[PDB]
Amino acid sequence: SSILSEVSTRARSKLPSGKNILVFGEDGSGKTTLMTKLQGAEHGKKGRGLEYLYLSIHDEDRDDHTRCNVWILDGDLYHKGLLKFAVSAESLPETLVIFVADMSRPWTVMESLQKWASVLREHIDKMKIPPEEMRELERKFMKDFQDYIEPVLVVCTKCDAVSVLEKEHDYRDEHDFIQSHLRRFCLQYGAALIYTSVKEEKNLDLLYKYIVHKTYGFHFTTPALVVEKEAVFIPAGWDNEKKIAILHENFTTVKPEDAYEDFIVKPPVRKLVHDKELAAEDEQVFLMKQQSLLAKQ
Amino acid sequence: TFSEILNRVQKAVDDLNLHSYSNLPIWVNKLDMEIERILGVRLQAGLRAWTQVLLGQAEDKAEVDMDTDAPQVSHKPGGEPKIKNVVHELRITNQVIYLNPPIEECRYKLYQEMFAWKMVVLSLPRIQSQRYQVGVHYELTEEEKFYRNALTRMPDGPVALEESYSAVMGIVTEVEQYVKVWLQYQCLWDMQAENIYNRLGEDLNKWQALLVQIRKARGTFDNAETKKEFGPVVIDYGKVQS
């Protein structure tokens, strides 16, 4: 035994399967579709609550395989308690957090992102980690931050809807506003931004490479792109307020301090405004009305 | 059976739209809420029946009391979910114990059987008040098209749904712990036979003692069992047992 145990402690081990990805976003933001596509599956059955899956990761050079746990939460907070089932104390460092930003509904991007970021914050509050462990994790994360040279990951979905925004809502290059706001939010939370389009198959391989890099520690070489309007990619540590200032030059009616809701408006969708409930007058009330009519005569 | 029923109600509502009655969206909206409520309780029953089948707590019809002379033609609201056997071939190659299918694939296979069950309800067509209007300029998403939202309409709140997730996680976790014990017999490979021979050295007494120990350890695998069931999940450890 002692023998077998000692042999075991020398195992060439597989890459860590325990690794976890947590995905957040509003319903209909494309969370499930995005992850299913990354998995290589054609059809993902839509779940309400805490959705599940895993990525098969293959290293061709070593001819080795490993698999990343996948967990995507439902948009409704009614299913929030499932997060304790997605991330635990032991599995928290192995977990990579993915937040979905819906570019088909840009006006709810920031608000939903603060919704998702907050919910994660209360979750880690409930987790009750030791303060020393929390400081150690923050040290590791910030060490990864400044050591970047040329974790939370923000992925933008259905960016091709920008083409609709140019037509349906008369958007232009200035409405720079949303991406500057998103980059400032990333700086606030130290996240990496990437733009994606499953419809156009944009940056899917770049996304997959970056996920494998951040989780398994694999290599990564693609540079930061911030010029293309709907293909912006910013790895962690690249963004800065001075670097964000390039977009503020292109503004001509708005200012960087201007509110998101004022410049970008939530459209009042023309739902079927239901008519007033018409109800037959009761016999008593109708007859009191008739009494009032007769008495005055 | 549900879709056929939802077909009949839609035709009647289309007749109401056909004759131009007042306030039809309000009455349809009230009926639509009532239908979703019924789909809520049936979906809650379906998950709990599925959870019982997953945990092995589903009661077979043999235990239905025969003294009750009343016919139970009404089928179970949660149905009779049948989780099929999912054997995992445990294996050791070049002294390296690895499992294909892994416990992670048990997580995949188990959650996958479950994802089929939820789709019995979540994929049903959603009743539309203005279905009769064709080409109506109204946005329609998947939640509008199907009752993909019924999973929040469960009567005991989200408990029935969270019990199903907990049940799947519990069974997969048990399988993972069981498989982890075999995946640990890679101890033959991890440090070689030569390392044990360095440990024994030239002492023939230690070699005599080791030969007795190896024979005792062999006796633990001389069992005819190849498959162990933990609820509906089977581990074909017989391949490793070979």
Q: What is the DSSP string of chain A?
A: -HHHHHHHTT--PPS-TT-EEEEE--TTSSHHHHHHHHHT-S-PPP-SSEEEEEEEEEETTTTEEEEEEEEEE-SSGGGGGGHHHH--TTTTTTEEEEEEEESSSGGGHHHHHHHHHHHHHHHHHHH---HHHHHHHHHHHHHHHHT----EEEEEE-GGGHHHHHHHS---S---HHHHHHHHHHHHHT-EEEE-BTTTTBSHHHHHHHHHHHHH-----PPPB-SSTT--EE-TTT--HHHHHHHHHH-SS--TTS-HHHHSPPP------PPP---PPPHHHHHHHHHHHHHH-
Please classify residue A239 by burial: count the beta carbons closer than 10 Å to its beta carbon, then call 0-12 exposed, 13-18 middle and 19+ buried.
Answer: buried
Are the C-beta atoms of B103 and B87 separated by less than 8 Å?
Answer: no
The pairs formed by A245-249 with CB atoms below 8 angstroms and a separation of 24 or more are A247/A176, A247/A179, A247/A180, A247/A183, A248/A176, A248/A180
Interstrand relation of A64-73 and B96-99 (parallel, antiparallel or unpaired): unpaired
Locus of tokens 């402690």: A9
Are the C-beta atoms of A47 and A74 separated by less than 8 Å?
Answer: yes
Q: For chain B, state the CA radius of gyration.
A: 28
Measured distance CA(B193)–CA(B188) in Å, rounded = 7
Task: Indicate the residue type of B105.
Answer: E
Task: Using CB atoms, pick whichever of B23, B138, B139 lies closest to residue A275.
Answer: B23
A68 - beta bridge partners? A55
Measured distance CA(A127)–CA(A86) in Å, rounded = 12
Question: Rounded to whole angstroms, what are the CA distances from B166 to A13, A168, B16, B100, B155?
Answer: 29, 45, 45, 24, 18
Measured distance CA(A102)–CA(A89) in Å, rounded = 30
Residue of chain B nearest A9, judged by CA positions: B190
Asked if A54 lies within 8 A of B22 by C-beta distance, the reply is no
Please classify residue A273 by burial: count the beta carbons closer than 10 Å to its beta carbon, then call 0-12 exposed, 13-18 middle and 19+ buried.
Answer: exposed
* Token pair for B218: 């062999």
Measured distance CA(A138)–CA(B99) in Å, rounded = 36
Among A123, A200, A127, A124, residue whose Cα is nearest residue A161: A200
**Rounded (5°) CA angle B85-B50-A35:** 80
Measured distance CA(B127)–CA(B160) in Å, rounded = 25
- Cβ count near A199 (within 10 Å): 13
Residue A265 region by backbone torsions, left for phi larger than 0, else alpha for psi between -120 and 50, else beta: beta
> DSSP secondary-structure letter at B59?
P
Measured distance CA(B178)–CA(B99) in Å, rounded = 11
- Cβ count near A7 (within 10 Å): 21
* Token pair for B189: 């490979």
Asked if A7 lies within 8 A of B185 by C-beta distance, the reply is no
Are the C-beta atoms of A106 and A179 separated by less than 8 Å?
Answer: no
| Residue A72: alpha-carbon gap to chain centroid | 10
> DSSP secondary-structure letter at B70?
S
* Residues on chain B touching A9 (C-beta within 8 angstroms): 190-191
Among A114, A106, A109, residue whose Cα is nearest residue A188: A114
* Residues on chain B touching A79 (C-beta within 8 angstroms): 151-152, 158, 161
Name the phi and psi angles at B146, rounded to 5: -120, 165
Dihedral sign from CA coordinates of A198, A201, A206, A212: positive
* Token pair for B86: 């999912």
Task: Using CB atoms, pick whichever of A10, A48, A85 lies closest to residue B148.
Answer: A48
- Cβ count near B81 (within 10 Å): 22
Interstrand relation of B227-230 and B96-99 (parallel, antiparallel or unpaired): unpaired
Locus of tokens 């789909």: B39
Measured distance CA(A88)–CA(A71) in Å, rounded = 13
Measured distance CA(B176)–CA(B171) in Å, rounded = 9
Interstrand relation of A64-73 and B90-93 (parallel, antiparallel or unpaired): unpaired
* Token pair for A155: 């992925």
Strands (E) across B28-163 are located at 90-93, 96-99
Measured distance CA(A141)–CA(A190) in Å, rounded = 9
| Residue A208: alpha-carbon gap to chain centroid | 15
Name the phi and psi angles at A233, rounded to 5: -130, 125
> DSSP secondary-structure letter at B98?
E
* Token pair for B141: 């998403």
Measured distance CA(A257)–CA(A254) in Å, rounded = 8
Residue of chain A nearest B103, judged by CA positions: A17
Task: Using CB atoms, pick whichever of B141, B158, B184 lies closest to residue A8.
Answer: B184
Are the C-beta atoms of A22 and B124 separated by less than 8 Å?
Answer: no
How close, in Å, is residue B196 to chain A by CA atoms? Answer: 7
Asked if B186 lies within 8 A of A7 by C-beta distance, the reply is yes
Locus of tokens 């088909």: A104
A152 - beta bridge partners? A97
- Cβ count near A188 (within 10 Å): 10
Name the phi and psi angles at B157, rounded to 5: 75, -150
Measured distance CA(B130)–CA(B12) in Å, rounded = 12
**DSSP-derived 3-state class of residue B215:** helix
Measured distance CA(A45)–CA(B116) in Å, rounded = 8
Task: Using CB atoms, pick whichever of A3, A17, A49 lies closest to residue B196.
Answer: A3
Residues 6+ apart with CB under 8 A from A164: A104
Measured distance CA(A56)–CA(A59) in Å, rounded = 10
Residues 6+ apart with CB under 8 A from B178: B103, B228, B230, B235
**Rounded (5°) CA angle A96-A98-A103:** 165
- Cβ count near A20 (within 10 Å): 22
* Token pair for B134: 């064709």
The DSSP result for A207-218, as a single string, is HHHHHHHHHH--
B101 prior amide bond cis, ω within 30: yes
Residue of chain A nearest B183, judged by CA positions: A8
Measured distance CA(A176)–CA(B132) in Å, rounded = 43
Residue A203 region by backbone torsions, left for phi larger than 0, else alpha for psi between -120 and 50, else beta: left
Measured distance CA(A192)–CA(B100) in Å, rounded = 35
